[PDB]
Amino acid sequence: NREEKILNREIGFAIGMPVCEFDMVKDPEVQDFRRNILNVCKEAVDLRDLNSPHSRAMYVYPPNVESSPELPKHIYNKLDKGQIIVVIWVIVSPNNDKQKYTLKINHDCVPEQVIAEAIRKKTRSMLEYQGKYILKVCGCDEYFLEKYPLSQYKYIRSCIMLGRMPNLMLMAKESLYSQLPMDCFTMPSYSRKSLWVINSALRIKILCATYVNVNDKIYVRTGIYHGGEPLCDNVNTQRVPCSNPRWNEWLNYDIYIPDLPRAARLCLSICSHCPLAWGNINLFDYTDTLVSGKMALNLWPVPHGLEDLLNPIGVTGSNPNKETPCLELEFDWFSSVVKFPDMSVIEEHANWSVSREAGFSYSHAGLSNRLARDNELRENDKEQLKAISTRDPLSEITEQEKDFLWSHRHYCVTIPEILPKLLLSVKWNSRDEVAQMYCLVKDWPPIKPEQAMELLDCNYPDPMVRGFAVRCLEKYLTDDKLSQYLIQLVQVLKYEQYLDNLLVRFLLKKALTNQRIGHFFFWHLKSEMHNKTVSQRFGLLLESYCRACGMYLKHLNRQVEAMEKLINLTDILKQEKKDETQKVQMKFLVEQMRRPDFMDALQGFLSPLNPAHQLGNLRLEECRIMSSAKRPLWLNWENPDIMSELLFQNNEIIFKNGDDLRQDMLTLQIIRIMENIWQNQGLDLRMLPYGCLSIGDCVGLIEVVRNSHTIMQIQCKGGLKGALQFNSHTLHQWLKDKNKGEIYDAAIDLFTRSCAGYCVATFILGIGDRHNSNIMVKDDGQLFHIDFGHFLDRERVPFVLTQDFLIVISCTKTREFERFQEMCYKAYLAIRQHANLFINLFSMMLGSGMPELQSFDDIAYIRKTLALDKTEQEALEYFMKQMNDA
Ligand SMILES: *C([C])([C])=[C]C(=O)[C][C]C(=O)N1[C][C]N([C]C2=[C]C3=C(S2)C(N2[C][C]O[C][C]2)=NC(C2=C4[C]=N[N]C4=[C][C]=[C]2)=N3)[C][C]1
């Protein structure tokens, strides 16, 4: 009906594919997903409409807050006896005259209390109307709707740290609520055995192949896997000529069918040894059914630099493009459909196995190193389990250590954080052990979200394990932290066996409960729709999101359309007008930007970098085509916020169409985390994790930091014509000229602190080497880095402290450089202590096709730079040596 067909066009524009493509998919799982996911949409809508309009205002404008109200000791010191000075603005006339009221208030004040005192100062002039008012940040669309202490709001904490005066606007409730239009979720047209009693070894037939188009013989190599680990020995068909690709071969593996775990996967590949193509298949379907009968798999091309003939970290499922090597399989058949057993059966088997081992005599337990001896665990080996739990995720557990953990599996519950080590020590090809592990996991106590995230990576495919990890996230993950780790959580969806799972339901709920979260959820999902390995999953999830997010769908289509214009325009530059002058390129740009359909599409929408930023009219006089060969556009928009002068009058963003910005995006995430760690640990090393967002196949947006210049910019602008640019003091003089008088010390102080941070950060992450063009400096002396090209690959210092920077700290033999060295040393230690977090963050990211991050071996570089297997004092000594080598 009318509204449904219009809604489909909108959704089709949002994603990039029409909805009716999903209607044509004749696959029970896809159609079930579309239908069954709608319960989450329904729940999310009902939560929003629960306590209107305030319930719906907090969905659209959620409070951007820190996870804790506790201020680190140095942050509290900046207050005047624990009190912050805030300025409160009121638009009083229809003429829009601004009146400011400055307050000195407690840092932990509730917004309502801050509004009360603002009215007290306003009423003083005259010598009523209580809580009909809300606070807004001047210059952007962020509100303080919730009853948090004022300091806990990020903006106000930033203003404390940076020393800035926070400028808030007082605003009437019904003005905001009026703007929130009544969205209307509607339901779409599409919305409406045997068990372990099988005594046999697993066979799989391989019938033939087609589309094996090529220039020795060929053969199919197969293997049965659980995650990265082979459940048994791999098995191969015979070498037969490529002219007649027909085998007809029942291959017998070394697995009892009853032992096949839930996430068991067949991994196959056609090989000439060189693997020509590959494919993986779940042996169980989404309904717990062991898959039987004839089946056809369209294979994928091999990725570059894949050593083994199989690809078990590879994504499961048939290729969308059916003009690729196709392989016809056939599985076994029995007297009925075979289903994986219920938890009740699994518990009965597990409880049976537990009491049987309770009765094992000394000698019986002698026969296997995996059998627990009850009441014979001493304090020495209890400490060994703690030491094993306190190691990194890339540390190899030996087969003796595995037997050992598993022997003491019941004691491991008293040290919950050991769980990922205990799960890797399980033999996932024993139903006896797996059933006990399920039971241990069922009652396993809650571990921190940071630690839980590891169990969603590619090492832990089992749904009972993943369900627990998701369950921890639901309990302990704040929306702040969800936003922070959102990109990793989006990636690990690729590792899920089925479209309908506990993780995707968790993320979608939050995306639909919190528009900040939904924004980036949409863009992260939309940027990989080119990647046919994930297009159907992400496409269907985007369909469900767009169908249920409300009016924000209209605002996303603005942004999508805006990016389509920029992608269209820059494609014309780097293809049609490839090597013309800057004048002729700029002329062409202006003429095409000024066309009516272009001109409306590129103004009056929300910044995809930060949707609280309204992008008004273009300042085309400030827009330019940049010197980088890929031709990134520098774009300047007006900020149409009434009090834009207070935050920033102009919002300017670099749009780039050509290069992969996913690496830069990951490095900037990490820099922010590292900084949070330091700021919580009490040392103020101010970093600068500016906005960076990938929106497609090598298309993306970069925030411009206002009042910033590269080192060469400082050297040239400060360098006489004819002369050479090599003058090292020129940087120090520039900072001296910008920061005259008593301000000078603060500039040098912020310069050292920021430099010590980017020294430590770049060394650890192994960033691409630093030019004078790569390093930047704000006018107040804040140093930071821009083009983070690659990471993770004797080990390199990327940021070699040349004289220029060292003279600004002072030059080597001084009290100023010693204190700076002590900043770097203490900084490096803090990240070592949190090594597991960063190791886990990178590990969740292997599903992304980032070239510098394909195998776990890539992540190992962090184990070398952080020096984990060494001691802490010897690790500080390692760092000292790598820097003095220079
Ligand atoms: C003398 C030789 C005469 C001086 C000159 O005339 C040469 C000037 C010069 O070479 N410049 C280098 C390029 N810049 C323009 C900029 C390029 C980039 C900028 S600014 C930024 N910024 C974003 C952050 O805010 C500040 C600026 N970023 C990037 C960029 C980024 C950022 N993240 N990832 C990423 C990848 C690629 C590029 N480029 C003029 C001076």
UniProtKB/Swiss-Prot annotation:
Residues 619-886 form the PI3K/PI4K catalytic domain. Residues 81-172 form the PI3K-RBD domain. The PI3K-ABD domain and the PI3K-RBD domain interact with the PI3K/PI4K kinase domain. The C2 PI3K-type domain may facilitate the recruitment to the plasma membrane. The inhibitory interactions with PIK3R1 are mediated by the PI3K-ABD domain and the C2 PI3K-type domain with the iSH2 (inter-SH2) region of PIK3R1, and the C2 PI3K-type domain, the PI3K helical domain, and the PI3K/PI4K kinase domain with the nSH2 (N-terminal SH2) region of PIK3R1. It is linked to PIK3CA mutations are involved in various type of cancer. Mutated isoforms participate in cellular transformation and tumorigenesis induced by oncogenic receptor tyrosine kinases (RTKs) and HRAS/KRAS. Interaction with HRAS/KRAS is required for Ras-driven tumor formation. Mutations increasing the lipid kinase activity are required for oncogenic signaling. The protein kinase activity may not be required for tumorigenesis. Changing residue 396 to K: In CLOVE, KERSEB, CRC, BC, CLAPO, MADAC, CCM4 and HFMH; somatic mutation; also found in glioblastoma multiforme and endometrial carcinoma; somatic mutation; shows an increase in lipid kinase activity; oncogenic in vivo; occurs in the interface between the PI3K helical domain and the nSH2 (N-terminal SH2) region of the p85 regulatory subunit and may reduce the inhibitory effect of p85; requires interaction with RAS to induce cellular transformation; increased AKT and RPS6 phosphorylation in HFMH patient's cells. Changing residue 847 to R: Found in an endometrial carcinoma sample; uncertain significance. It comes from the Eukaryota. Keywords: Angiogenesis, ATP-binding, Disease variant, Kinase, Lipid metabolism, Nucleotide-binding, Phagocytosis, Proto-oncogene, Serine/threonine-protein kinase, Transferase. Changing residue 6 to N: In MCAP; increased phosphatidylinositol 3-kinase signaling; decreased interaction with p85 regulatory subunit; no effect on protein abundance. Residues 785-802 are annotated as: Activation loop. Phosphoinositide-3-kinase (PI3K) phosphorylates phosphatidylinositol (PI) and its phosphorylated derivatives at position 3 of the inositol ring to produce 3-phosphoinositides. Uses ATP and PtdIns(4,5)P2 (phosphatidylinositol 4,5-bisphosphate) to generate phosphatidylinositol 3,4,5-trisphosphate (PIP3). PIP3 plays a key role by recruiting PH domain-containing proteins to the membrane, including AKT1 and PDPK1, activating signaling cascades involved in cell growth, survival, proliferation, motility and morphology. Participates in cellular signaling in response to various growth factors. The avian sarcoma virus 16 genome encodes an oncogene derived from PIK3CA. Changing residue 865 to N: Found in a glioblastoma multiforme sample; uncertain significance. Residues 198-341 form the C2 PI3K-type domain. Changing residue 400 to R: In BC; uncertain significance. Changing residue 863 to Q: In CRC; uncertain significance. It catalyses: a 1,2-diacyl-sn-glycero-3-phospho-(1D-myo-inositol-4,5-bisphosphate) + ATP = a 1,2-diacyl-sn-glycero-3-phospho-(1D-myo-inositol-3,4,5-trisphosphate) + ADP + H(+); a 1,2-diacyl-sn-glycero-3-phospho-(1D-myo-inositol) + ATP = a 1,2-diacyl-sn-glycero-3-phospho-(1D-myo-inositol-3-phosphate) + ADP + H(+); L-seryl-[protein] + ATP = O-phospho-L-seryl-[protein] + ADP + H(+); 1,2-dioctanoyl-sn-glycero-3-phospho-(1D-myo-inositol-4,5-bisphosphate) + ATP = 1,2-dioctanoyl-sn-glycero-3-phospho-(1D-myo-inositol-3,4,5-trisphosphate) + ADP + H(+). It is an enzyme of class 2 (transferase). GO terms for biological process: actin cytoskeleton organization; adipose tissue development; angiogenesis; anoikis; autosome genomic imprinting; cardiac muscle cell contraction; cardiac muscle contraction; cell migration. This is Phosphatidylinositol 4,5-bisphosphate 3-kinase catalytic subunit alpha isoform. Residues 766-774 are annotated as: Catalytic loop. Changing residue 307 to Q: In CRC; likely involved in disease pathogenesis; shows an increase in lipid kinase activity; may disrupt the interaction of the C2 PI3K-type domain with the iSH2 region of the p85 regulatory subunit. The record marks 630 as: Implicated in the recognition of ATP as well as PIP2. Also crucial for autophosphorylation of the p85alpha subunit. Changing residue 875 to V: In MCAP; also found in an endometrial carcinoma sample. Heterodimer of a catalytic subunit PIK3CA and a p85 regulatory subunit (PIK3R1, PIK3R2 or PIK3R3). Interacts with IRS1 in nuclear extracts. Interacts with RUFY3. Interacts with RASD2. Interacts with APPL1. Interacts with HRAS and KRAS. Interaction with HRAS/KRAS is required for PI3K pathway signaling and cell proliferation stimulated by EGF and FGF2. Interacts with FAM83B; activates the PI3K/AKT signaling cascade.
